[PDB]
């Protein structure tokens, strides 16, 4: 098994990382509220992202509106090329996703042990073309397989196209209908002219935006995986086709990562780990610019807490672009958490019919675009699942990296009493001076029971202040590690420094024990 | 005059702080896109906020959804208690805000020098009750004053109530209509139970949320002042009525700030500066909890760049709560940038008919709430206006505080050449190690012309690296100040430290000149 999601979900809920929105009103499907801890984790995730991409690549951040008029999203194609198929129940109403009902129905009839082998083959011939059947072509499949409701069957109406955009109206009731942006990339396209001039009109530049996009899902019942309101991080990197080679690729070429190409998928071959440099050598990856971001993405995700042996890069097949999607193995299977797409002919030239880029040799250049889109809720949930562990005890802890954990350290004073506040106080300030997130724990119970609470929310380190720390005359406090649970004893003035180094990749815990005396119960 | 907004707006646009959204589609009113510089300034504003309130008060951050179902917003009252009055043109369509048309019409007829004094008095008797007239009562005023369109008159239809919420539909076309949240506070109310348990069920606690709210304005034509999509920072501080006294008030009591009470407004008295402690003494401010946030708000706003002599705290009059709104004087007049409200009976007890708070003496307590709401676009625009200056030249510069300026420092290498990159490189890293935002300038032109560019976007400091910095053997570079424009010469290794100190309130520029040799042309 991948993970015990029932335990994981109970913990996520009990400690309020995220929970069903509008719970006291019955709760709305596809919508979630992130709590204090979830919010901390989330901001952390996002700031780490900011650093990794925006800062490293000098990207031009932009903040566009979510309210977009219909004309824009029509030039896009999004009124019914961005729809799903609904099948309505012929009388008592309920709506279902046609892709899903069909897939489920086939899998059902298929795993019946009184069906023919040639049926099984006919049906798989069908499941492998699901996302390609047209309106009429998919409608005939419903009849030819006698599909009906799944809760006591009734008949199902012919599948119709259902737009996934939230319809609204901008201004006084009138002639300006609009939608909530389905993606974040469009605003960047709309600002291509301004962004080009901001970059002095030079050829390669990247633009990013962090915000919420909306997808009116039909019947979402899979947690943060399928949601109607989600936070996204988009990047639009524009390149001259004539000069399509990233100068910083050498910094990533040495990485080994599982590549799941389209040809492997066609051949029915498995995932295949491969050195990135070699990947571009052998042509499994078209160019270094695409390869660079792939490696950068891999680095980002692994830094956030996603396990590399459950992380693969899958490339789709014939479903106008060379796309590589970062996928992670969860209790829901392999899901797309980050979509990176190399695109030559895209929606930018549509809004022009924004603009092009003139060169020094008087040449109008339509730049290609590499667009890595990060789905942060899924990324976050992947971290939850790859990080949730159960202890020897029945206790629970998240093994978040210190760079993403809600807060890096947690100080524990035994006494609420005074003479301690000066020690607690100075520790807090030194931590802050070192840029180390912390929170003073003031809960009621045993020290071990208090550390079990901090572990539950994934706090990386801990510094407990006992009586010897105040009285016994060279002031030393004890530092605990989340994972190992092992402890050491060091001078309280030195602790901020080593915790900072522990938070970064500077020193390891094995080094801390090497330099500092161990400590027990 | 307050400020030259035409110049200010041309600069804000040319450097792309913020601009009209969907410009290539004609542009949508009330919607704006913030550019790279605006985004930097904005994030800065927000992070400063985070520090000031969330960190200082250990507030519980939350991230709720913008999509809210109708039942919630009905328990609120927001389907037509949160509407405005529209007057439609009896045939050729156009819609107008009734408050505004009426106010304008009266002011017109009023400033006609052939009108009676008793008319002027009747009409002011009317302008002072605008936000109190009912549907029918306001309708009669339109007839009794013969109000018509303002662009060649035609008749105006009776004023009807127009809801300001963006209507939408959640899920498959059906029986779940919803809106885009008009305010951010409601999600906090909905999570009262979870937040109380998160705080161990203790009496005073605060919850905050930073995000976008929506108001479907009718005809917005005043820049960032009246927008349809805006970013907000809400705080909900809950207190036990029995123990309503903030322990940290003493930290703010010494502040002097302009208070514009309701009684002063009734008496036709002017704004009145007053020590905060005295304010609570004399009863102009009900309690210290309310007073605390007021002082905290004042501190926040002044830190961001808002001038204290253009900042006042105004209290409304009879328009179920004791509210104090932070107002700033702009080219649009006195506008509400931060609304702080003390409330006893509010919308939390409505959702319960979320919950209450049980005490140690078995007592169900309905907590009061102080809700400071920060309108960040307006705050930001206020900073633009209180900070925009024109130089002796026609050049322009923003005098942003270093804590809010897009980036704190800007290094200027004369040569693109190599031997310099090691100096530029080390400076960059030392700056980053000191947590000082910077950007290496690589533009083409004179050094003074390059500094004029950095000033235009409000970059606080500058470090120019010339040939003497590399060759001439004890390596010193020159540090320029934005405001004074004066320069000094110091060791390039020492510069990160003093720039950091300059960015904070540690040392002043007068100190830098005191310790370091001055430098000219």
């Amino acid at each position: 098994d991948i993970v015990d999601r029932a335990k994981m979900e109970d913990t996520l809920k009990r400690r309020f990382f995220y929970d069903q929105a509008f719970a006291i009103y019955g709760g709305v499907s596809g919508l979630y509220d992130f709590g204090p801890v979830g919010c901390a984790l989330k901001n952390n995730i996002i700031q780490t992202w900011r650093q990794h991409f925006i800062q490293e690549e000098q990207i031009l951040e932009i903040d566009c509106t979510m309210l977009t008029p219909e004309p824009v999203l029509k030039t896009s194609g999004h009124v019914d090329k961005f729809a799903d198929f609904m099948v309505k129940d012929v009388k008592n109403g309920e709506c279902f996703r046609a892709d899903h009902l069909l897939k489920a129905h086939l899998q059902k009839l298929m795993s019946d042990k009184k069906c023919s082998v040639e049926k099984k083959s006919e049906m798989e011939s069908v499941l492998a073309q699901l996302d390609n059947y047209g309106q009429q072509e998919l409608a005939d499949l419903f009849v030819n397989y006698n599909v009906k409701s799944p809760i006591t069957g009734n008949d199902l109406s012919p599948p119709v196209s259902f737009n996934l955009m939230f319809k609204t109206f901008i201004g006084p009731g009138g002639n300006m209908p609009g939608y909530l942006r389905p993606e974040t990339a469009q605003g960047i396209f709309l600002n291509f002219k301004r962004l080009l001039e901001f970059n002095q009109g030079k050829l390669p530049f990247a633009a990013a935006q962090i915000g919420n996009s909306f997808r009116n899902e039909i019947s979402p019942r899979s947690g943060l995986i399928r949601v109607r309101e989600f936070t996204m991080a988009e990047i639009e990197h524009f390149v001259d086709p004539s000069e399509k080679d990233h100068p910083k690729f050498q910094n990533v070429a040495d990485l080994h990562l599982y590549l799941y190409s389209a040809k492997a998928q066609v051949s029915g071959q498995s995932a295949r780990k491969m050195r990135l440099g070699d990947a571009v050598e052998q042509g499994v990856i078209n160019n270094t610019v695409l390869g660079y971001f792939i490696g950068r993405i891999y680095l980002y995700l692994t830094k956030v807490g996603i396990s590399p042996d459950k992380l693969r890069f899958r490339q789709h097949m014939e479903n106008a672009c060379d796309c590589w999607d970062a996928e992670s193995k969860t209790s829901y299977g392999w899901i797309e958490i980050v979509g990176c797409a190399d695109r030559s002919c895209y929606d930018l030239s549509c809004h022009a019919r924004k603009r092009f880029q003139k060169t020094l040799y008087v040449e109008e250049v339509v730049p290609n675009v590499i667009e890595p889109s990060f789905g942060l809720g899924r990324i976050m949930y992947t971290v939850f699942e790859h990080t949730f562990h159960v202890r020897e005890g029945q206790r629970t802890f998240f093994s978040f990296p210190a760079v993403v954990a809600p807060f890096k350290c947690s100080v524990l004073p035994l006494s609420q009493n005074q003479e301690f506040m000066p020690f607690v106080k100075e520790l807090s300030e030194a931590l802050t001076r070192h840029g180390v997130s912390h929170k003073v724990d003031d809960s009621s119970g045993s020290i071990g029971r208090r550390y079990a609470r901090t572990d539950e929310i994934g706090v990386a380190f801990g510094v407990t202040i006992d009586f010897d720390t105040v009285n016994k005359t060279p002031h030393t406090a004890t530092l605990r590690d989340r994972d190992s649970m092992r402890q050491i004893r060091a001078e309280i003035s030195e602790l901020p420094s080593i915790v900072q180094d522990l938070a970064n990749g500077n020193i390891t815990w094995a080094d801390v024990e090497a330099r500092y005396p161990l400590f027990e119960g």
Side-chain angles (χ1 to χ4, degrees), chain A residues 3-318 320-353 356-393 395-519 521:
Chain A
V3 72
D4 188 4
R5 93 154 62 116
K7 268 187 178 171
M8 196 199 51
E9 288 180 344
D10 192 59
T11 292
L12 293 166
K13 181 188 182 181
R14 202 166 36 70
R15 279 318 185 97
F16 196 30
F17 281 78
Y18 66 95
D19 200 13
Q20 186 181 23
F22 314 103
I24 62 173
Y25 275 84
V28 181
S29 305
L31 302 184
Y32 289 93
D33 289 354
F34 288 83
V37 185
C39 273
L41 207 149
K42 180 171 178 172
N43 297 139
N44 283 349
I45 297 268
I46 301 184
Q47 198 57 38
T48 308
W49 195 84
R50 277 211 155 81
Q51 262 290 124
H52 205 66
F53 296 100
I54 297 179
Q55 310 271 50
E56 196 71 24
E57 258 57 76
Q58 292 301 98
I59 308 186
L60 306 180
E61 199 189 326
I62 194 174
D63 195 13
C64 295
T65 68
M66 313 175 185
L67 262 27
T68 71
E70 170 158 56
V72 179
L73 290 178
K74 191 153 191 175
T75 305
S76 219
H78 274 80
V79 194
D80 255 4
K81 282 199 175 180
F82 170 87
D84 266 327
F85 290 107
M86 259 201 313
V87 284
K88 282 182 291 178
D89 186 329
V90 298
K91 256 206 173 180
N92 252 155
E94 201 173 2
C95 301
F96 296 92
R97 206 171 184 187
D99 284 46
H100 181 245
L101 261 198
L102 184 63
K103 202 189 193 181
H105 193 89
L106 291 198
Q107 287 178 161
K108 194 168 74 179
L109 295 179
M110 214 177 324
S111 54
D112 183 353
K113 299 182 67 62
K114 54 190 169 181
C115 179
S116 63
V117 179
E118 307 207 350
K119 244 303 185 193
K120 290 162 187 169
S121 184
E122 162 179 307
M123 282 179 168
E124 295 170 346
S125 171
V126 166
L127 290 183
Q129 301 177 20
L130 281 172
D131 48 350
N132 289 324
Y133 293 115
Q135 191 281 325
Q136 177 67 33
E137 198 174 4
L138 196 146
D140 289 350
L141 291 171
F142 264 78
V143 185
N144 291 171
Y145 286 97
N146 211 39
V147 182
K148 17 210 57 61
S149 176
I151 62 178
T152 113
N154 282 343
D155 295 356
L156 290 173
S157 62
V160 291
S161 192
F162 172 72
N163 203 39
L164 295 168
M165 288 181 165
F166 284 97
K167 295 184 177 177
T168 185
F169 279 93
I170 316 176
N175 295 334
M176 186 163 61
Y179 306 94
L180 282 59
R181 64 178 179 189
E183 289 176 3
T184 294
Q186 233 64 221
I188 301 180
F189 292 140
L190 294 169
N191 297 258
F192 182 89
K193 299 175 185 175
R194 313 178 199 172
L195 273 40
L196 180 61
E197 298 173 9
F198 192 85
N199 206 53
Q200 296 177 357
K202 32 167 74 78
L203 322 171
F205 78 95
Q209 181 169 186
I210 305 172
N212 288 13
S213 288
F214 304 82
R215 289 187 61 179
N216 196 194
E217 301 286 349
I218 290 156
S219 182
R221 290 174 184 180
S222 54
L224 294 176
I225 306 302
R226 295 177 180 178
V227 285
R228 288 160 177 167
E229 180 173 331
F230 47 90
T231 308
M232 285 259 275
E234 275 272 23
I235 291 182
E236 300 296 317
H237 184 106
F238 304 92
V239 272
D240 190 327
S242 301
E243 197 178 9
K244 197 172 186 178
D245 182 32
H246 207 285
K248 300 178 66 176
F249 181 79
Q250 294 177 357
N251 303 343
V252 195
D254 201 16
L255 284 184
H256 289 90
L257 40 106
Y258 290 86
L259 296 176
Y260 196 52
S261 62
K263 292 185 173 171
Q265 300 176 55
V266 163
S267 316
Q269 290 186 352
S270 300
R272 166 192 170 199
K273 166 181 277 185
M274 197 168 168
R275 198 193 85 114
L276 188 65
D278 299 351
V280 188
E281 292 173 4
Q282 305 183 14
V284 78
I285 296 181
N286 186 222
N287 58 79
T288 64
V289 180
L290 212 190
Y292 178 71
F293 287 102
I294 295 185
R296 280 267 85 186
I297 294 172
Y298 170 85
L299 286 176
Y300 176 67
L301 299 175
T302 48
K303 181 189 298 181
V304 176
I306 302 178
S307 295
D309 294 345
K310 298 176 184 180
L311 201 169
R312 74 179 183 182
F313 288 88
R314 172 194 155 262
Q315 166 196 41
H316 358 139
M317 47 198 179
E318 288 188 355
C321 49
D322 186 17
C323 311
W324 283 84
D325 294 353
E327 294 188 342
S328 59
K329 191 173 182 178
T330 66
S331 62
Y332 299 88
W334 292 99
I335 59 169
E336 177 195 353
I337 56 184
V338 179
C340 183
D342 193 332
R343 226 151 198 167
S344 302
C345 292
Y346 48 106
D347 295 355
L348 182 148
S349 53
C350 298
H351 295 98
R353 295 177 180 176
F356 297 102
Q357 302 185 355
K358 53 183 178 182
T359 188
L360 297 172
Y361 295 97
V362 187
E363 176 188 15
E364 297 180 353
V365 180
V366 200
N368 295 359
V369 70
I370 288 74
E371 43 184 22
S373 58
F374 303 72
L376 304 171
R378 292 187 175 190
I379 292 176
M380 209 174 310
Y381 184 80
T382 310
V383 186
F384 291 142
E385 276 204 9
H386 290 198
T387 270
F388 182 83
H389 299 301
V390 179
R391 276 165 174 337
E392 264 199 337
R395 289 182 175 178
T396 269
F397 80 102
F398 280 105
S399 60
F400 296 130
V403 80
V404 154
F407 44 95
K408 299 174 181 179
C409 186
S410 178
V411 316
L412 299 199
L414 286 189
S415 296
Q416 314 161 335
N417 150 112
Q418 30 264 313
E419 319 153 11
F420 275 94
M421 300 319 297
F423 279 98
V424 169
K425 202 178 184 175
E426 171 69 29
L427 219 195
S428 192
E429 300 183 349
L431 255 27
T432 313
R433 229 147 46 208
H434 283 76
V436 179
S437 333
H438 59 280
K439 166 156 193 170
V440 178
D441 177 331
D442 70 337
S443 86
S444 56
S446 176
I447 172 176
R449 293 178 181 178
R450 291 204 291 173
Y451 267 122
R453 292 193 178 96
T454 60
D455 287 6
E456 199 172 32
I457 60 174
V459 181
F461 303 111
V463 172
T464 142
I465 297 172
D466 44 33
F467 288 108
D468 294 353
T469 310
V470 175
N471 303 326
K472 276 184 168 179
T473 316
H475 305 100
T476 65
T478 153
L479 170 68
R480 200 195 87 153
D481 179 64
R482 187 226 293 109
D483 295 329
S484 64
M485 213 161 186
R486 301 163 64 90
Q487 315 194 218
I488 63 144
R489 192 79 173 192
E491 174 75 20
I492 198 168
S493 73
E494 285 155 32
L495 283 172
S497 302
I498 65 173
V499 170
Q500 183 188 22
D501 294 347
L502 277 170
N504 308 346
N506 305 349
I507 79 185
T508 62
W509 182 255
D511 301 332
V512 171
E513 295 197 341
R515 291 87 181 270
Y516 299 98
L518 283 52
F519 198 84

